[PDB]
């Protein structure tokens, strides 16, 4: 009894970044990690 449940799509919400904005850089965080590993 009652309304039917339904899913919500966040397709656009998720595809927004990769389409409008350039990818971020993690060098600041990994620079020390890389030198240390080496």
């Amino acid at each position: 009894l009652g309304a039917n449940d339904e899913l919500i799509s966040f397709k656009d919400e998720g595809e927004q970044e990769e389409k409008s904005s350039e990818n971020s850089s993690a060098e600041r965080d990994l620079a020390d990690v890389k030198s240390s590993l080496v």
């Binding site: 009894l1 009652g2 309304a3 039917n4 449940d5 339904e6 899913l7 919500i8 799509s9 966040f10 397709k11 919400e13 998720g14 595809e15 990769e18 389409k19 990818n23 850089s25 993690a26 060098e27 965080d29 990994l30 990690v33 890389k34 240390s36 590993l37 080496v38």
Partner: protein, 508 residues
């Protein structure tokens, strides 16, 4: 006696090219020692033949020390644009990718770190790595246990996969989702958790990767870190969880995640609130177990507060309302939930949402919630007093008019929803008077002619309730309802047939 003790590059390049491997090995060591000094570096970087010889020796040698020295030399050259270019133009990428298969750590580390440097600053490096088969090699290395190495490897994957559907498919085919989820469930190193969450976020928008991440235990693994002190990590997990949510409605062991999500609704960060609401809405869809858990930890109250805080922001109210809709039907505590929405002061705002500026998607969901709330008799009067009936009728009339995708919603769904809500509200004698007074009977009779089975059912259902009152049964009969209701006795839908028989009995 022995003199001349203490052009070097051109000499070493010749030695690395020597057919004698013992000579190559010794020359390799010397070149490496020289790469340690900035002065000797430029000399090496500026020699196309030197770099090429270093690259060739690395991938062809069978001596571990020579592999180590040449790989280390290239790593040392990768700190400068000129070095990166030379490595790139000399076939260094295919060589480095091959080195990713090395059984020696020092070699693997020089290789992955140098590749990361190429990917970050060398135009054309991403494509070359993909072509060389780097993606496949990298995913295979995710079973390594050095967390710093894993952090650099996963970031390489993120750089290569971002905005590239083909790369995401390659990662999927190599078993990337399971390996990434394992990392989230095993390690505590924040930088690795973060670089890994970034990859999962990128993959979560791929229709093929989504189901693989979920089945691997991704929802539970990401949920484990929603309370970590790292805001960037929490945000990445939340966005990823939301993208995956519509595919995780069949997963077990979600207790912990659901609990944390409800607590997150109380966040001052509106972005966290919005995501958690969206995730909760999808996870409660047709899963009584999840609804039970959400209700048990105060989800109704949290969601009502969320609706109140959201105002006219429909990216928050739609999921919060959809979630409340799911929580108020078909589960052991649905009755408790229907009452909680009222006891937590939510009836007035829920009814308000039926009015402009709300758009159809939100209105559709709100009608559905009111339909559920009406199942609880204690909600009959409050809903009437807030003006729910007149507005539901208004929406019905408008939607029906159109049927004789609007803003993304099928008006037929609004007709079905409003009429269903009215059917339940008509269980109350006082509501029947209001419904009757809005001259709705002629419209309800017309809906019996609807080609949509579910619309005929709710139409007959509301007429059935209204017919309980003589004068109403009379008005229904005067509208010529007898003919259609008689034909409906032969409906394929048990509800339609039963309701029709009930109205016919009452008209007589």
């Amino acid at each position: 006696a022995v003199v001349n003790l203490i052009r070097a590059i051109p000499e070493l390049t010749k030695l690395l090219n020597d057919e004698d491997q013992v000579v190559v090995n010794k020359a390799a060591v010397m070149v490496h020692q020289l790469s340690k000094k900035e002065a000797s570096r430029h000399a090496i970087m500026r020699s196309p033949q030197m770099v090429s010889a270093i690259v060739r020796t690395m991938q062809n040698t069978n001596d571990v020390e020579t592999a180590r020295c040449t790989a280390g030399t290239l790593h040392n050259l990768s700190h400068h644009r000129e070095g990166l270019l030379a490595i790139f133009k000399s076939g260094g990428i295919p060589a480095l990718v091959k080195m990713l298969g090395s059984p020696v750590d020092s070699v693997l580390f020089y290789a992955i770190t140098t590749l990361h440097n190429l990917l970050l600053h060398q135009e054309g490096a991403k494509m070359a790595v993909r072509l060389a088969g780097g993606l496949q090699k990298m995913v295979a290395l995710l079973n390594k246990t050095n967390v710093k190495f894993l952090a650099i490897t996963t970031d390489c994957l993120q750089i290569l996969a971002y905005g590239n559907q083909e790369s995401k498919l390659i990662i999927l085919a190599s078993g990337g989702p399971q390996a990434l989820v394992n990392i989230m469930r095993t390690y505590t190193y924040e930088k690795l958790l973060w670089t890994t969450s970034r990859v999962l976020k990128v993959l979560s928008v791929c229709s093929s990767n989504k189901p693989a991440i979920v089945e691997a235990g991704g929802m539970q693994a990401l949920g484990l870190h929603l309370t970590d002190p790292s805001q960037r990590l929490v945000q990445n997990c939340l966005w990823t969880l939301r993208n995956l949510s519509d595919a995780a409605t069949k997963q077990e062991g979600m207790e912990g995640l659901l609990g944390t999500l409800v607590q997150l609704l109380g966040s001052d960060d509106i972005n966290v609130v919005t995501c958690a609401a969206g995730i909760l809405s999808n996870l409660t869809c047709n899963n009584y177990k999840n609804k039970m858990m959400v209700c048990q930890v105060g989800g109704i109250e949290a969601l009502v507060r969320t609706v109140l805080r959201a105002g006219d922001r429909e990216d928050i109210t739609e999921p919060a309302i959809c979630a409340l809709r799911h929580l108020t039907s078909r589960h052991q505590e649905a009755e408790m939930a229907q009452n909680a929405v009222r006891l937590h002061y939510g009836l007035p705002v829920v009814v308000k949402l039926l009015h402009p500026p709300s758009h159809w998607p939100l209105i559709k969901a709100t009608v559905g919630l009111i339909r559920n709330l009406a199942l609880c008799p204690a909600n009959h009067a409050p809903l009437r007093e807030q003006g729910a009936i007149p507005r539901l009728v208004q929406l019905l009339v408008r939607a029906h008019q159109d049927t004789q995708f609007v803003e993304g919603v099928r008006m037929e769904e609004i007709v079905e929803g409003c009429t269903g809500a009215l059917h339940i509200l008509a269980r109350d004698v006082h509501n029947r008077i209001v419904i009757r007074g809005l001259n709705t009977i002629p419209l309800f009779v017309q809906l019996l002619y609807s080609p949509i089975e579910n619309i005929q059912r709710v139409a007959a259902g509301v007429l059935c309730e209204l017919a309980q009152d003589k004068e109403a049964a009379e008005a229904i009969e005067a509208e010529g309802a007898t003919a259609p209701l008689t034909e409906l006795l032969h409906s394929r839908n048990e509800g339609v047939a039963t309701y029709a028989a009930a109205v016919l009995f009452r008209m007589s």
